[PDB]
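Hello again,

I reread your note about wanting to compare the complex against the isolated chains. To keep things tidy I'm splitting this into two emails, and this first one only covers the full assembly. Below are the input lines as submitted, including protein chains and any nucleic acid or small-molecule components. They are followed by the predicted structure of everything together. The single-chain runs will come separately.
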Amino acid sequence: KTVVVTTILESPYVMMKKNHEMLEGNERYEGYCVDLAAEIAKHCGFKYKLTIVGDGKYGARDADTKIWNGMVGELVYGKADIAIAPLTITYVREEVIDFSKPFMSLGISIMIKKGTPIESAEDLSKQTEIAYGTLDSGSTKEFFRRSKIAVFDKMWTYMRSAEPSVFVRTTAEGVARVRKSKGKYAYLLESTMNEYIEQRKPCDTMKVGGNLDSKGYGIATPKGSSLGNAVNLAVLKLSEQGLLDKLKNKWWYD
Amino acid sequence: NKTVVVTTILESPYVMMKKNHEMLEGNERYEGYCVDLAAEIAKHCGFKYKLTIVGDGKYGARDADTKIWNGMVGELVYGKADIAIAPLTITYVREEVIDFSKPFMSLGISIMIKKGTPIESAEDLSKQTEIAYGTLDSGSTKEFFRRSKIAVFDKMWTYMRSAEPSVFVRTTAEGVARVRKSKGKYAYLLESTMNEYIEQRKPCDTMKVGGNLDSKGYGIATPKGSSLGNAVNLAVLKLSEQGLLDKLKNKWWYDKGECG
Ligand SMILES: C[C@@H]1N(C)c2ccc(Cl)cc2S(=O)(=O)N1C
Ligand SMILES: C[C@@H]1N(C)c2ccc(Cl)cc2S(=O)(=O)N1C
Ligand SMILES: N[C@@H](CCC(=O)O)C(=O)O
Ligand SMILES: N[C@@H](CCC(=O)O)C(=O)O
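Full-complex prediction:
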């Protein structure tokens, strides 16, 4: 009767507390999604255990084996009962799992070293001095692979063959490359993470131009889960009480 | 298979009467964002449909006494329509009685003023009484202020609910006209989508001030347990990821803007 929640280490959604080595269970973690999980469980009235996804991935279907990895796979293959994390609502995912109404908005955004002469995605697709890449096994990478839009298709064709790999396993990994590469690398990531980094030291990164798309994160359940309805209503309630806004302010507090 | 009844509402630029509507019939009488959206959705889910303007011209609220739903929500609840394709706001009380797809457009509650009006925030409105302000009836915006426990919004509700004469309007157009005619003495609380649209229409004498008071979206609504729900939801996501929804908003908001 304990609900297994799958989630992922991603600041400021889920982070390890200081001195977590002597802590146990859910008390090991803090962040936006940790608070969110507590509020949902309170409303739906269930006990839950937070577990970090084994592979540290969000969820992608390996075209070769047609096997889902990451948090999506955990739901699909019955390892978890619910995903509470910055998991992007997409078409391919909605085909295999259920999403609640979005609890937070985001768009794919460009992260440049401050001062970098880039103002748009067109600018990136018209230069080769500055490199660019995305996170592996995520919705951002799938966006460019699938985009039949002019600029985005060009950006993808460069990215898929880039040597060495412009793709990273973690968001933190992509952050460093923008910083190290002296303005020769632009990271493609979601505006939420981008806006978060923009506020943190050494404050040398910059969100540039508008978002490339418009979407949201949603709480995910296995298809035909009895938990789905109550969770969706919980999210809506929290939104209308303004609690989602206060959580955003709290963890993106400058 | 049967012709699907679509309930919707005459709200610019979502559903508008074509210039030659009087010599047109069926769905051909109408044009707008939601009309194009309905065509796209129907094509993917492979159904034929008939657009129907909701009888009472309301979005949907539940009578406190009779517990009866009006507007487009009522149409779905009592089985008069199979689907709603309109700027219908996703809310908690509505999700309890009908289903919504994932949102196809984002909005927040915003403030409309006549240009030059000394108001830059909702707190500015709550602090004064010289400038009156209100909302649309039978809609999600009015329910927001009625239900809010946030001090400034509750202060605004306490004012609005007892204001004389009534600061509430029956249509968006009535609300816009009231802003334009009141010489800066009326501000209108409406959804950012509507606000931004009007901002681009002649006489170009209004504007949106401050940030949005909340964050939500419009969704395609179906009766609970409808078999159309899944296909429609998937269709909305597909159109979103193809960039179709962004192109539709550009077409109806800014591609024909009249204020430069
Ligand atoms: C179709 C649908 N769209 C457009 C939007 C729009 C805004 C937000 Cl905050 C979330 C979503 S989503 O993730 O529910 N999905 C992609
Ligand atoms: C909870 C949920 N929230 C926060 C949001 C946020 C952004 C958009 Cl575009 C739509 C919605 S909604 O209408 O699906 N609903 C109110
Ligand atoms: N939120 C994304 C991961 C972040 C990214 O791909 O940039 C997902 O759900 O796949
Ligand atoms: N979109 C609102 C109506 C407009 C408003 O209330 O401002 C609704 O669905 O109730």
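For quick reference: The first strand of chain A starts at residue 2 and ends at 7.

B.
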